[PDB]
Design a protein around this ligand. Structure first.
Ligand code: CA
Ligand code: CL
Ligand code: CL
Lengths: 111, 728
């Protein structure tokens, strides 16, 4: 199961790149949608095909497969390494500032 | 299982085919109706604005003009130059912009500092500079009148008189769409209403009109297995329901409701006075098409099981009926079906807690717009009536300036097709394609929109023709009727909700009543937010905030509760204009002449309360803004999407090598794509950040001082998002 925050993100991305309406999203387009979601694979040619294209039910199942294989130790890191502007110098009171305007708020436990 | 719609949306050359002839006959003389082209006239006024900028530079009178109308001019000029494709012409705009910058940097150092903080934030700094009351000052038209000292053509005059309210209406297509989309964002305090010399102007409808005239004629193609296209076999009503006369609960209007040991209802619907069998067969097959594709469409209503369609002698019908007794003949075709009792409780019924009301309303608006994407329109959900009410009426006629007086509003949603079960009684369907073609429905109710634009102002004695930008709507009238259907759906919701509210608050604790009406306000805004999400994919939470930027929830609560219950009638005429100020906080009070019927309010028939004076506006003003906010957010988001993808290819052709250009331009092609992302939509800027990094891979040569900062904030936002995503 995914989180409500990212199924919303996936639903809009799907709705945006479906250019003509009804779930008729063609394999040629799904490269860019996953690029917009933080993915860049080489070969993905399965998981419904539904005719040769797929619906949203197939999309939101296609994803956790690509998200239940993400060794996010390097994903959650890299993320901290951004604001580490100098190098390896971790953040400070600023690391509660950033988390107070991107997508969330409400009592970060600053350790 | 598979879940998708059976309709593909595309575009077509022209909706104006097989339309009535563009001719207004009056006093025996036939006057042809001619289009004033939007974009052609728009561009003439922008080049006139450009020449005027040049006559302002030569006048060496840049001090005579206030500092933040040279800010408007320069910011617009910089934005226009970026929007220009070829380098030769964008340099002739920067030619014009540089004296305005030289002066501002020298004689207005602070404003210069504020302007440059915007120019590195966006490629179209004018659209964020105008996210406030600054938009109401028409700097472009002001400069045109002052320095272009020569009379406008008859069409620049026409364009000016129609779009006088803001300079944004002259912006080229991408800049206007981007401005209109982002004018709903959280920094933006813009609302399309300014106060004139004691007078109040509203131009929410003009935003929609100026948007719609830049759009391409839509067209929907139905799958070959669609309900209206697939050849369906005969109905196999192999069984006949045996009508007892004590199993009948009730009789809700030419429909008899029968009980069952399973605590649901077998209903039998009888032929109307004028009604063919076809209609009852269509209702049968609709119920089956819904049933078959209910998972496919994720339809949420409780759907009736179509039992049989056959003929029954009128003697048996009249025999089994007694207690509340539109049938015509001695033989009556019948449609009998099974449905829960929720299917027969109208959604405006007093006997629902507002937990069940909200839940059931959510069901209805979901299936209304899911079935719209499916391509099916329900044009008679309620009898809001030729004289059939038009939700988006200023965009469909030349005369009207606001929405008309809803007559006997509570009786309109009386037998509304919205039930606790969900959508109901879905026989009187219409294909969405009927709105984009010259169907019988459209030339009857929308004949002006399809003929187009007569008014004495329009008439040119020289020409012999009536010229207006309205006649341009002939090639696009389907786009107008599409948006109007959306607003029409949500207005039937609103009357239904208000009906419930009136019948629950009557015979009631003043705080308990007021609290009910603001929950009714919230479910209405929530309904429109749901529509936007179903139509565009925008997260409904964000669709709600975008909406509440434009529509004042609390103003809507207090004009709904005041006008849809009769307490104001018990006021004398002039403590009433003491109460109106509380519901129109800045806006003018609702002026009206009519004599009030005691215990009712405004009532032409003296028995049923209406929404509005005899020949006035509907007084639900922020409802009107709500609908336009809803409909503009939909159509605006879709046009922004199109400009996004149109520019997306540009950066991809430059990136791949299919179009060779310099480094310093490839980056501003990418940065421009940043400006066409949806407001509050992050992944769209994650995607263009990916394009930015690839451009720096392609051009390590290049300096990136102009876009490092604007693309850092996307990078830092995406980093911050994923650390917040690690909530575990
Ligand atoms: Ca598609
Ligand atoms: Cl001026
Ligand atoms: Cl017009």
């Amino acid at each position: 199961q995914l989180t409500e925050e990212q199924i919303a993100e996936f639903k809009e991305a799907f709705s945006l790149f479906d250019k003509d309406g009804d779930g008729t999203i063609t394999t040629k387009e799904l490269g860019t949608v996953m690029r917009s979601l933080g993915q860049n694979p080489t070969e993905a040619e399965l998981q419904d095909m539904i005719n040769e294209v797929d619906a949203d039910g197939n999309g939101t199942i296609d994803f956790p497969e690509f998200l239940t294989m993400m060794a996010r130790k390097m994903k959650d890191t890299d993320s901290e390494e951004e604001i580490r502007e100098a190098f390896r110098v971790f953040d400070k009171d600023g690391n509660g500032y950033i988390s107070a305007a991107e997508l969330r708020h409400v009592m970060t436990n600053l350790g | 299982v598979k879940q998708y719609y059976f309709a593909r949306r595309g575009e077509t050359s022209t909706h104006d085919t097989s339309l009535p002839p563009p001719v207004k006959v009056l006093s025996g003389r036939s006057i042809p109706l001619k289009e004033i082209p939007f974009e052609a006239t728009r561009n003439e006024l922008v080049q006139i604005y450009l020449t005027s900028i040049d006559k302002l530079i030569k006048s060496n009178k840049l001090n005579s003009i206030p500092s933040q109308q040279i800010a408007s001019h320069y910011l617009f000029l910089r934005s226009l130059a970026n929007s220009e494709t070829d380098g030769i012409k964008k340099n002739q705009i920067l030619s014009l912009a540089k004296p305005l910058g030289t002066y501002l940097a020298s004689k207005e150092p602070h404003v210069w500092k504020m302007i440059n903080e915007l120019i590195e934030k966006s490629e179209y700094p004018i659209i964020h500079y105008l996210k406030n009351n600054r938009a109401h000052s028409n700097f472009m038209l002001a400069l045109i009148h002052e320095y272009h000292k020569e009379p406008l053509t008859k069409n620049q005059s026409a364009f000016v008189q129609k779009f006088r309210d803001s300079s944004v209406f002259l912006f080229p297509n991408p800049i206007y769409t981007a401005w209109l989309a982002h004018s709903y964002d959280e920094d933006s305090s813009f609302n399309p209403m300014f106060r004139e010399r004691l007078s109040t102007n509203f131009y929410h409808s003009t935003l929609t009109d100026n948007l719609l005239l830049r759009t391409e004629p839509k067209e929907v193609t139905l799958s070959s297995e669609h309900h209206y296209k697939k050849e369906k076999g005969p109905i196999d009503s192999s069984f006949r329901y045996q009508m007892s006369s004590d199993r009948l609960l009730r009789i809700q209007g030419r429909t008899l409701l029968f009980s069952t040991p399973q605590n649901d209802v077998v209903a039998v619907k009888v032929q109307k006075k004028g009604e063919p069998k076809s209609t009852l067969e269509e209702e049968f097959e609709m119920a089956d098409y819904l049933l078959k594709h209910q998972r496919r469409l994720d339809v949420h209503s409780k759907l009736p099981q179509p039992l049989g369609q056959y003929s029954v002698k009128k003697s048996e019908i009249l025999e089994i009926s007694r207690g509340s007794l539109i049938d015509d003949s001695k033989d009556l075709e019948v449609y009998v079906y099974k449905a829960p009792q929720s299917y027969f409780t109208y959604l405006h019924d007093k006997n629902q807690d507002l937990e069940d009301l909200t839940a059931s309303v959510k069901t209805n608006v979901h299936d209304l717009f899911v079935l719209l994407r499916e391509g099916i329109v329900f044009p008679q959900l309620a009898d809001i009536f030729k004289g059939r009410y038009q939700a988006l009426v200023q965009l469909l006629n030349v005369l009207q300036f606001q929405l008309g007086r809803i007559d006997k509003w509570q009786k309109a949603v009386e037998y509304v097709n919205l039930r606790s079960s969900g959508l109901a009684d879905l026989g009187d369907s219409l294909p969405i394609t009927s709105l984009f073609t010259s169907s019988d429905f459209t030339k009857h109710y929308f004949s002006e929109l399809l003929t187009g634009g007569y008014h004495p102002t329009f008439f040119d004695k020289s020409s012999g023709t009536a010229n207006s930008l309205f006649t341009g709507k002939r090639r696009l009238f389907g786009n107008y009727l599409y948006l109007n259907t959306i607003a029409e759906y949500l207005l039937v919701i609103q009357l239904t909700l208000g009906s419930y509210g009136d019948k629950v608050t009557r015979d009631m604790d003043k705080p308990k009543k007021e609290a009910v009406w603001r929950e009714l306000a919230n479910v209405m805004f929530t309904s429109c937010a749901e529509a936007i999400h179903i139509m565009t994919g925008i997260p409904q939470s964000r669709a709600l905030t975008l909406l509440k930027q434009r529509a004042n929830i609390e103003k809507h609560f207090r004009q709904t509760q005041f006008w849809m219950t009769p307490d104001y009638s018990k006021l004398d005429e002039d403590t009433l204009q003491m109460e109106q100020y509380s519901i129109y906080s800045g806006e003018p009070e609702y002026e009206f002449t009519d004599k009030l019927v005691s215990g009712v309010g405004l009532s032409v028939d003296g028995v049923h309360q209406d929404l509005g004076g005899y020949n006035r506006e509907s007084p639900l003003r922020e409802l009107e803004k709500l609908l336009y906010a809803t409909v503009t957010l939909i159509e605006g988001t879709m046009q922004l999407d199109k400009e996004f993808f149109k520019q997306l290819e540009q950066v991809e052709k430059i990136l791949s090598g299919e179009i060779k250009t310099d480094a310093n331009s490839c980056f501003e092609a990418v940065a421009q794509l940043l400006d066409l992302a949806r407001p509050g939509c992050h992944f769209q800027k994650r995607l263009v950040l990916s394009y930015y990094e690839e451009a720096k891979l392609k051009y390590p040569s290049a300096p990136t001082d102009a876009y490092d900062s604007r693309f850092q904030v996307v990078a830092r936002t995406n980093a911050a998002i994923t650390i917040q995503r690690f909530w575990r």
